[PDB]
Amino acid sequence: QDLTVKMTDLQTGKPVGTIELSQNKYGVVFIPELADLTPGMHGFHIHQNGSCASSEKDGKVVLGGAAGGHYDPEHTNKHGFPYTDDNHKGDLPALFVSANGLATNPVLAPRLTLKELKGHAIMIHAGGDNHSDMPKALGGGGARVACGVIQ
Amino acid sequence: QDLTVKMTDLQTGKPVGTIELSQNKYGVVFIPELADLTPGMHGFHIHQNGSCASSEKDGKVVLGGAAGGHYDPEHTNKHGFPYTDDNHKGDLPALFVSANGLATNPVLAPRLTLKELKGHAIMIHAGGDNHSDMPKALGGGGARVACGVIQ
Ligand SMILES: [Cu+2]
Ligand SMILES: [Cu+2]
Ligand SMILES: [Zn+2]
Ligand SMILES: [Zn+2]
Numbered sequence: 001q002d003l004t005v006k007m008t009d010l011q012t013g014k015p016v017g018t019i020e021l022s023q024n025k026y027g028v029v030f031i032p033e034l035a036d037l038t039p040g041m042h043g044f045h046i047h048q049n050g051s052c053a054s055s056e057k058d059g060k061v062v063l064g065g066a067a068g069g070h071y072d073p074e075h076t077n078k079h080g081f082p083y084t085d086d087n088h089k090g091d092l093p094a095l096f097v098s099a100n101g102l103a104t105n106p107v108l109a110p111r112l113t114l115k116e117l118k119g120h121a122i123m124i125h126a127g128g129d130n131h132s133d134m135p136k137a138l139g140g141g142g143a144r145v146a147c148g149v150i151q
Numbered sequence: 152q153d154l155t156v157k158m159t160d161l162q163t164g165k166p167v168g169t170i171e172l173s174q175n176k177y178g179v180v181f182i183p184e185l186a187d188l189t190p191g192m193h194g195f196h197i198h199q200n201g202s203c204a205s206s207e208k209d210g211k212v213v214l215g216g217a218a219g220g221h222y223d224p225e226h227t228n229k230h231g232f233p234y235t236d237d238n239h240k241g242d243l244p245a246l247f248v249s250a251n252g253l254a255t256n257p258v259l260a261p262r263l264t265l266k267e268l269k270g271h272a273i274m275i276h277a278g279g280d281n282h283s284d285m286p287k288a289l290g291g292g293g294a295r296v297a298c299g300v301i302q
Contacts, residue, residue, distance in 0.1 A: 026177075026234045026261040041247060041256065083177045083259050094256065096192060096247055105192065105245065106282075108234050110177040110261065131257075 003114065005122055007034060007148040008052065010063040016146050017103070019122060027110040028117065032095060034103040034146070042097060043125030043141025044107065046071040046090035050119040052147035064144035067121045079138045081131045082109050090120075094129045121149045154265065156273055158185060158299040159203065161214040167297050168254070170273060178261040179268065183246060185254040185297070193248060194276030194292025195258065197222040197241035201270040203298035215295035218272045230289045232282045233260050241271075245280045272300045 003021040008014065017034030030044075048068035055065025070079065071090025080087030093107045125141030132139060154172040159165065168185030181195075199219035206216025221230065222241025231238030244258045276292030283290060 024234055025236070029234065040250075081257070083175055083180065085176070093259075099191075106232070108244075108259070108261070110259070 001114075003117075003150065005148040005150055007122070007124070007146045009036065009146055010052070010144055019148065021114065021117065021150070023114040027108055028112040028114060029106055029108055030092065030122075031106040032103040034097075035101055037097045037101050037103055037124070037146070038126070039097050039099050039101065041094040041128040042103075042145075043123075043127060043129040043139055044092045044095035045088070045123050045125075045129075045141070046092060046109075046112075046117065046150075047121045047123050048072070048090075050121055050149045050151075052121055052149060062144075064121075064123065064147045067123060067144075067147060070138070071120055073116070079131065079133050082111065085111065091131065095124060117150050119150065121147055123147050152265075154268075154301065156299040156301055158273070158275070158297045160187065160297055161203070161295055170299065172265065172268065172301070174265040178259055179263040179265060180257055180259055181243065181273075182257040183254040185248075186252055188248045188252050188254055188275070188297070189277070190248050190250050190252065192245040192279040193254075193296075194274075194278060194280040194290055195243045195246035196239070196274050196276075196280075196292070197243060197260075197263075197268065197301075198272045198274050199223070199241075201272055201300045201302075203272055203300060213295075215272075215274065215298045218274060218295075218298060221289070222271055224267070230282065230284050233262065236262065242282065246275060268301050270301065272298055274298050 020031040051066040053066035070088035124146035127142040129139030171182040202217040204217035221239035275297035278293040280290030
């Protein structure tokens, strides 16, 4: 009953690994098994649409823009922590990438359930995430680098 | 009703910052505000005794050995994840240290409560933590580098 999600690099078009999702007494667990990522902490979020295609914006291209914004079932219109209820239910803890470019440190999302995740897409950004909309919106994750649809 | 914990470097004897503890619907939140630490992921645990003094072992010195082993109220005798019940209730998520040596990424402990933490000590190790006793016990955190008693 556990889920496996294939992740692809939006830039190169090549796969960077897989993320396994599981449900437990305390929430959903995201177990990463990725590679070819830049070291550091990465913005890690569940997005609205179940797609990783591109989108257009004022004449420019947005890799993984079809996924839309962050998963916000309660229409909170705010970005925040994984343990605060007044923000995107899709706000996951940041994803850590080792010096060798690997990601295998599991993360927990207390406000989520497996059933509701299907049809949505997991997203990995280039910048980090300070879990706020200040001083940079959406935690400063910036561009989208890796993406995967949860089927 | 929130707690502030002073942390000291066991080696140099100098303070490296403070960690703020708070309680919320989903557990205890550890908000770090440290510095002078080596980049990477660090083993982060709550230990048994409320002390950071040294201890002796077979003729050798153990910095922060007086704190004892990991907090294990249920006497599970196993090291594991922060979201599994059959292991040290004191198993916290690993602590991330930036390239500039700062630690400010908050962490959540679902199985803990503030009241029970007092009298214990927060510990920071040199190695990481793979949340298991294999292939290295206690997640491979090795030596203790920073410590703080929760009063
Ligand atoms: Cu995102
Ligand atoms: Cu420890
Ligand atoms: Zn968000
Ligand atoms: Zn432990």
